[model samples]
Target: MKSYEIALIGNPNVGKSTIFNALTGENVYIGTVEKKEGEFEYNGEKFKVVDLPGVYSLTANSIDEIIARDYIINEKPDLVVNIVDATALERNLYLTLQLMEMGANLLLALNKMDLAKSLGIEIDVDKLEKILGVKVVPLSAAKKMGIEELKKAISIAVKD
Candidate 1:
């Protein structure tokens, strides 16, 4: 039987790696998106969490974008977790938009909800989900919120 594969993606400083670390219970992958390729785990359900260097767009501006873009294009994982910063939803949406074009039904992690709340930002998650046609999970890796739901979502994804 083949192990299920999942990929983690987000722009820089959006807490993608932090969330990955918290979810995986360690820094099993490269800290920087520009670092080596990425890392994976071989538990009952295997995960290849690649830290795509934080980028605004997939338009080839730097090697990071190229690396991230080409990797996704070629590998084509089973599922993609689009880590989004609630604070920079618009900016992060660009990447989410790009991922949609790849025929990947993504799960948008509205990360840093605490930061957004402190900044007086309240995201209309239902509206956002309606627009994206994908699952929207509000997560705060720093605060350790929403990790269980994230895992459950991923587990369901693995089955799908």
Candidate 2:
């Protein structure tokens, strides 16, 4: 079977590690020091889930930014699950837009949808998907919501 390198990335505390564990079923270290990878098999394909350190942008402000940006540019992962805080979407989206600009195969995982709903903040998932021309997976990683949908998104993205 073919293997794909999927980079799981987001801001410092948007539950990127939570999402990784949700998908990989392991308690991988959630930190900003180095790249932590987990293997997951889905739809007969093996995905090497590389947990890049959380970064706000490709700009080299910190070690994370440099390592993450360097890896994405050099390694060229097969797909990027760009998790964003659903509550602070606009602020998180700055990184999202940069990812798209790099022409990476991308999926927008709107993490913390539960919090967003609780705060009475509503984002039009469909509209945002269309506008950005990317697949958007609304999920609450802590609750393991939309993990299957995210898998499907990955399958579709890799297939196409």
Candidate 3:
């Protein structure tokens, strides 16, 4: 089986690390000096997931932003998973738009759904997916909900 690389990018406090842990489980290891890398096999496909530094945008204004921007542009990972906070959808989308403009093979992990529900915030996943032209998986990593669905989405996305 062939192995593919996927990156997880998001802002601080968006449960990005929780999602990374959920996806990678016990198969994770530290990478380079800053990022975390992990491996998981789904539906006969292997994925190496990289947890990029959390930043608000990829404008190269800060070290984290520059690192993320360079990795997407240079390494060209098979998939770039943009984990956005459901509670702050509008604000989080600034990075999403940047990723789209960068032409990344992107997927949105709408994290913190549990908190969103507690706050009475509703998100239409299908509509967001249709509008963004990318797969959107709503999950609360802290609760371990919708992880399998995310794995399934990642598997299908890389093949495309």
Candidate 4:
């Protein structure tokens, strides 16, 4: 059973680390300043989930974004999970486009779904997938709404 290295990338305060801790079952610090890595298994599969530093864009502007870009370029993980705050789709989608341009294998985790709904923001998950050409999984990381679906999507991403 080979373990997959999954890079979880997102902007600051997008609940990326929240989901990372939930999925990996570790109580690593969740904040904007550091990177946390953990490992966990699901459905007989293992994953080394890397909680990368949150960045607004992959411009390598700050130390965090630079570290993130270097990892995706040099280390080349099996899959890159882009966690977008569902309420800030336009803002987050910029990073999504950058990831696509870099030719990375991508799976979108639309985090903060509950908040989005509370704010009356509706997202067509299927339409987003069709537009982006990658699978999108809606999730509320704090509530752990779509963890199972994210896992299934990861399985499919790695298989493909």
Question: Which residue segments of model 3 deviate by more than 4 Å?
Answer: 26-35
In model 4, the clashing pairs are: none
**The best candidate in terms of lDDT:** 3
Q: State TM-scores per candidate.
A: 0.84, 0.93, 0.93, 0.93
- Model 4, 92-160: lDDT tens per residue? 989888999998999999999999899999999999899889999999989879998998899779877
- Candidate 3's displacement at residue 128, Å, is 1.0
Each prediction's whole-model lDDT (CA): 0.76, 0.87, 0.89, 0.88
Best by TM-score: 4
lDDT: the better of candidates 1 and 2: 2
Clashing pairs in 2: none
lDDT of 2 at 59: 90
Measured with C-alpha atoms, the lDDT of residue 108 in candidate 3 is 92
lDDT digits (tens) for residues 112-135 of candidate 3: 999999999999999999998999
Name the regions of candidate 1 deviating beyond 4 angstroms.
Answer: 28-44
Alpha-carbon RMSD to native, per candidate: 3.2, 2.2, 2.7, 2.0
Q: In terms of TM-score, how similar is model 4 to the real structure?
A: 0.93
**Model 4 Cα displacement at 143 (Å)?**
0.8
